[PDB]
Amino acid sequence: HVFFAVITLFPEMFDAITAYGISGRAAKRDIVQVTCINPRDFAEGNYRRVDERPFGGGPGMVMMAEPLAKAINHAKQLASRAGCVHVPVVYMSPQGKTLNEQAVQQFVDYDGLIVLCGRYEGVDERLIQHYVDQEWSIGDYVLSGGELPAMVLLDSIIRRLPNVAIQDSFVDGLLDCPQYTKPDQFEGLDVPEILKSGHHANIEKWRFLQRYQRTLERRPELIEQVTLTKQQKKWLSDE
Amino acid sequence: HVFFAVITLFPEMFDAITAYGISGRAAKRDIVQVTCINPRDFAERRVDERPFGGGPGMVMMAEPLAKAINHAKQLASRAGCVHVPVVYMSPQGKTLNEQAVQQFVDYDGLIVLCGRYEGVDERLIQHYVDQEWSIGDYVLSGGELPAMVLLDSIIRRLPNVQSAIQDSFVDGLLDCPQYTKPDQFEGLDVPEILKSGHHANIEKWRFLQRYQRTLERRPELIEQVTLTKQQKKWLSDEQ
Numbered sequence: 001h002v003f004f005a006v007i008t009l010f011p012e013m014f015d016a017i018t019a020y021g022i023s024g025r026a027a028k029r030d031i032v033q034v035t036c037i038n039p040r041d042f043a044e045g046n047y048r049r050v051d052e053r054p055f056g057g058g059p060g061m062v063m064m065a066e067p068l069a070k071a072i073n074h075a076k077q078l079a080s081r082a083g084c085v086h087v088p089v090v091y092m093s094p095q096g097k098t099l100n101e102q103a104v105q106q107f108v109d110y111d112g113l114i115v116l117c118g119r120y121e122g123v124d125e126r127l128i129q130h131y132v133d134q135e136w137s138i139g140d141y142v143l144s145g146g147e148l149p150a151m152v153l154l155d156s157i158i159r160r161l162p163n164v165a166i167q168d169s170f171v172d173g174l175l176d177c178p179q180y181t182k183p184d185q186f187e188g189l190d191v192p193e194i195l196k197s198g199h200h201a202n203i204e205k206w207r208f209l210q211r212y213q214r215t216l217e218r219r220p221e222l223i224e225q226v227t228l229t230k231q232q233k234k235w236l237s238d239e
Numbered sequence: 240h241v242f243f244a245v246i247t248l249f250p251e252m253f254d255a256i257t258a259y260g261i262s263g264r265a266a267k268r269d270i271v272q273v274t275c276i277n278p279r280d281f282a283e284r285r286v287d288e289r290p291f292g293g294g295p296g297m298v299m300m301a302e303p304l305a306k307a308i309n310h311a312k313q314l315a316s317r318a319g320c321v322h323v324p325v326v327y328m329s330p331q332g333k334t335l336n337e338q339a340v341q342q343f344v345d346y347d348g349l350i351v352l353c354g355r356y357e358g359v360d361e362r363l364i365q366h367y368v369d370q371e372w373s374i375g376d377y378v379l380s381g382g383e384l385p386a387m388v389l390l391d392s393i394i395r396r397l398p399n400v401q402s403a404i405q406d407s408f409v410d411g412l413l414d415c416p417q418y419t420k421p422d423q424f425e426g427l428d429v430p431e432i433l434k435s436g437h438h439a440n441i442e443k444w445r446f447l448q449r450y451q452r453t454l455e456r457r458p459e460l461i462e463q464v465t466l467t468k469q470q471k472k473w474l475s476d477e478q
């Protein structure tokens with residue numbers, strides 16, 4: 001029962017992944033658990049402020065360390081009571097390591113994650129220094145909040161958990177091949193005949209050549225780092 | 240009034256960005272409009288089918304998406320949009336980044352196609368899709384989260400949505416650490432430059448932090464940065 005806790009000002013945003021699709025069916029079947037913790041539930045004052053003006057001047061607001069520390073402690077206690085051995089705290093940040101398939105595969109082995117979602121101009125650095133084990137970025141772009149990155153990370157993990165993908169792009173270092181389904185003819189374009197109903201073996205051959213050629217056309221640096229089985233090497237030299 | 244149309248089996252997911260945060264305030268203020276089109280409203284009610292050649296999973300059918308995309312196109316024309324590309328979210332697309340995001344701001348609006356399951360029929364892409372974009376080298380269970388990532392990244396750079404000049408990747412460097420109250424957190428002080436500094440030495444410190452952080456974490460990005468003479472002077476004043 002993989003345990004996910006997200007520290008977020010907008011818990012309702014996570015309904016996008018707990019209430020729909022394959023990730024929703026996983027939450028509803030209790031294969032995973034998603035608990036949302038709002039730092040405003042650990043803030044002081046009638047307004048429950050979690051943000052304040054940055055030292056050194058500058059626009060915007062910075063999330064205060066003290067409510068987030070309390071929210072992370074609560075999340076740590078929730079995970080311990082859930083039977084988890086250890087759950088690392090991940091901060092979503094453009095300054096973290098870049099999520100890719102290799103990272104996803106490692107995350108699948110974890111008992112669970114606590115994911116910290118920032119807002120405003122970001123989170124006080126001392127909070128990161130003391131409470132965060134890992135920083136991950138979903139890409140070289142800036143979003144208005146860490147909730148969507150958290151959801152991207154969570155979704156990428158949930159779909160590889162047992163009882164929730166062998167042909168995934170990047171799983172073998174190559175891109176997936178073009179897919180075709182009914183109708184037989186679409187706006188003058190037909191399915192390649194090899195795929196239509198030939199035997200099991202020759203369809204598999206075509207799929208590899210398509211993965212390699214597509215990977216070659218779009219992402220040639222991945223061809224540099226790919227390792228081929230002997231059956232695949234045979235197919236290439238034939239062309 | 241930028242126009243967004245998303246083709247998605249799960250329109251409710253997009254509440255995550257239209258109802259919360261800065262992107263939500265933009266939708267409520269009518270600075271942007273997001274319209275969801277469900278391919279199930281255009282089927283004869285199946286929208287996915289088994290792939291030719293066998294293989295696991297389902298492939299989204301071209302004909303409902305063609306009808307949905309055309310409806311999206313007429314929706315966009317009736318909104319007055321001149322230039323609206325059809326974008327398909329796919330890990331086989333070009334990788335989104337901040338430079339790409341800036342280019343999207345130039346469009347009158349977007350039609351974004353969200354695939355599910357094993358993906359979208361290849362021929363539908365060939366005939367109806369102008370651009371393919373990936374948010375990263377990992378596989379998600381659907382294109383809705385990537386669509387939202389793209390939309391959020393665009394929305395936060397639109398006029399009337401101050402504090403975006405200091406973003407990561409804006410100048411090719413990562414952002415510097417942020418601090419706010421209290422003066423001391425669990426033994427850690429705010430750097431004194433930020434506490435009691437002034438315009439020149441704070442600006443110097445922030446730049447040296449951006450540079451050093453980029454060098455430690457993303458050393459390839461230093462290759463692609465061009466420095467003002469004042470920044471070049473600041474660096475040499477250290478080394």
Ligand SMILES: Nc1ncnc2c1ncn2[C@@H]1O[C@H](CSCC[C@H](N)C(=O)O)[C@@H](O)[C@H]1O
Nearest residue numbers: 092093118121138142143145146149407414
């Ligand atoms: N590409 C991305 N990957 C992961 N988290 C991201 C992200 N873009 C924004 N976020 C998170 O969204 C929140 C608000 S944006 C703050 C951005 C920060 N000044 C910077 O450029 O480093 C932060 O917690 C930030 O880490």
Ligand SMILES: Nc1ncnc2c1ncn2[C@@H]1O[C@H](CSCC[C@H](N)C(=O)O)[C@@H](O)[C@H]1O
Nearest residue numbers: 169176328329354373374378379381382385
């Ligand atoms: N990194 C990413 N960027 C953009 N769209 C993505 C994505 N990961 C998944 N999607 C979209 O999510 C949907 C279901 S995932 C299908 C993935 C496909 N087998 C492949 O390996 O290429 C598809 O429409 C896909 O384009």
